[PDB]
């Protein structure tokens, strides 16, 4: 029948491909730091790997917190308001400035965290140097995230791609200058990767500020002309809308850290295969998270037009595109399950164990698109808190216990890490059932409370 489904699908492939390119650039920014410090030593590679493992969960909190700012400016721009957007954007910038402080303190406590994991003194000092270098980058990253939330909300995902790509291609020379002490810069070494990431983040922030000021496309909003004074009432309002979608992004990462802790007794050739499979699944997850963000933008815009049916159609085409791309990338994992496992490592025992685990990772990838797209879909509906309840009670209550029961115990022959992955499937499923049934209730509720909650 198609009708409007093909039209909405095409408008969703665009506005989401640039987001995918931006996300691959963001991950490559850390990949380059790791693979370029490995050309100096192995200590400097492990240091900038542990520092990244401590840096990602901390900054994901604020990154999630600003995804409440995204559909707020999406809804206003959709209705035709476009004159209270500047106030909200300025208040969000101040909110990013404020939320930078706790993250900076937590990263300042890095030296204590790296004692509870048996890190030698050389790796510890290199990790602390990296963290104390990227602390200066933290506020610029949060401000850039807020600014890209403004531009994304107006359905303009192109700039963050370019400024993203220019970032990645500017990390290659700046790393080289500082790690190897060229062009008069000090020979920082492996620590130089952090002091180059800080510079590239400030450069990206400056470039995005420049684009918003001139643009000629966003010139109608005139964001940086009035400089609205801070208001604590709104600042609290925009924190209660973003905290639930940051708690979930924190708890997912903590769940996987805990599973890494629990699978450690199973050996050392099993944890390596586990982390290989998990790392590949992380990129295949980068694939449908881009669809979810675009769906959130589209449903926010359509609720602004007071088009409930249009919002529903956009959500459904997003939930279909996610499943289709998930099937495509799951089949390519099942076929090329050995070549991908040979890019990571050269231990054939590890490549065999990871070739077996990348068979459950395929079903994992198929379920972790119906989860993510649905989570993004109702986030546009301003149903933040619901996420935090259904995602949490499905992740921690289900997956971690059934992972332990079907894994290291036999209260059901104990299975290996292929039991933890089965628990992951059991959690991601029924996460994609609670988050999928909440959406169905929302899409069929009174045609008025939908819009009213869409303003909440």
């Amino acid at each position: 029948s198609v009708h409007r489904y093909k039209k909405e699908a095409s408008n969703l492939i665009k506005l989401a491909t640039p987001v995918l390119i931006a996300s691959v650039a963001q991950t490559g920014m850390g990949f380059v730091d790791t693979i370029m410090a490995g050309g100096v030593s192995a200590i400097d590679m492990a240091a900038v790997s542990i520092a990244a493992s401590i840096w990602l969960p901390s900054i994901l909190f604020g990154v999630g917190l600003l995804m409440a700012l995204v559909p707020v400016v999406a809804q206003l721009n959709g209705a035709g308001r476009q004159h209270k957007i500047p106030f909200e954007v300025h208040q969000g910038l101040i909110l990013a400035l404020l939320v930078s402080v706790p993250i900076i303190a937590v990263l300042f406590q890095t030296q204590f965290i790296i004692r509870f994991m048996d890190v030698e003194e050389a790796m510890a000092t290199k990790t602390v140097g990296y963290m104390h270098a990227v602390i200066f980058a933290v506020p610029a990253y949060l401000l850039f995230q807020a600014l890209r939330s403004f531009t994304d909300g107006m359905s303009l995902t192109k700039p963050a791609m370019v400024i993203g790509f220019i970032g990645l291609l500017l990390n290659i020379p700046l790393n080289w200058i500082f790690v190897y002490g060229k062009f008069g810069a000090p020979e920082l070494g492996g620590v130089g990767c952090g002091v180059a990431t800080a510079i590239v983040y400030w450069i990206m922030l400056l470039l995005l500020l420049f684009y918003i000021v001139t643009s000629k496309r966003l010139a109608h909003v005139k964001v940086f002309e009035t400089f609205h004074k801070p208001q604590p009432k709104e600042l609290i309002r925009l924190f209660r809308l973003g905290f639930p979608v940051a708690a979930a992004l924190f708890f997912e990462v903590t769940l996987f850290a805990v599973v890494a802790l629990l699978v450690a007794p199973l050996g050392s050739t099993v944890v390596a295969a586990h982390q290989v499979a998990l790392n590949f699944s992380s990129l295949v997850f980068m694939f449908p998270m881009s669809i979810g963000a675009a769906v959130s933008i589209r449903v926010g815009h359509k609720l602004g037009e007071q088009d409930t049916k249009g919002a529903a159609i956009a959500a459904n085409v997003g939930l279909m595109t996610g499943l289709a791309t998930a099937c495509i990338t799951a089949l390519l994992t099942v076929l090329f399950r050995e070549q991908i496992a040979l890019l990571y490592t050269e231990n054939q025992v590890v490549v065999a164990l990871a070739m077996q685990l990348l068979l459950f990772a395929a079903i994992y990838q198929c379920m972790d698109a119906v989860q993510v797209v649905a989570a993004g879909s109702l986030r546009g509906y301003k149903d933040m808190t619901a996420i935090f309840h259904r995602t949490f009670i499905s992740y921690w209550v289900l997956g971690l216990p059934t992972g332990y029961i079907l894994g290291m115990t036999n209260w059901l022959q104990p299975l290996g890490a292929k039991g933890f992955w089965l628990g992951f499937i059991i959690g991601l499923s029924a996460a994609a059932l609670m988050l999928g049934q909440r959406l169905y209730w929302l899409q069929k509720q009174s045609d008025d409370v939908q819009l009213h909650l869409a303003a909440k």
Partner: nanobody
Amino acid sequence: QRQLVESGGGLVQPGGSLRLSCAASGIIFKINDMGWFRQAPGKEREGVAGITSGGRTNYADSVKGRFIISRDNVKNTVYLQMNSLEPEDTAVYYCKSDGLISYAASQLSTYWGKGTPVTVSS
């Protein structure tokens, strides 16, 4: 044992030169750093030389000017050239390799070697 295979050794007269080699398999070896450790009877295992991923040499104290470590990446080998060997150098030399097991791991992994005997005397 399997990851690292040492090769070389034998009876070297004092003042002679020897060239030990260490072949690595199952290791990325482009990001793993290598080293050589001697262990004579009565004494404790100690380092002799070590090279990083960037080719930085870190010879021991009473090894300077006598031992030169080299490394190849096309064929995964670590060479140790010993010159002006004295009767105090007789020991079993072990090839140690530490570095990330894969591109997704965080903590580095260490692999030892079986070791090759080296006896210096008339």
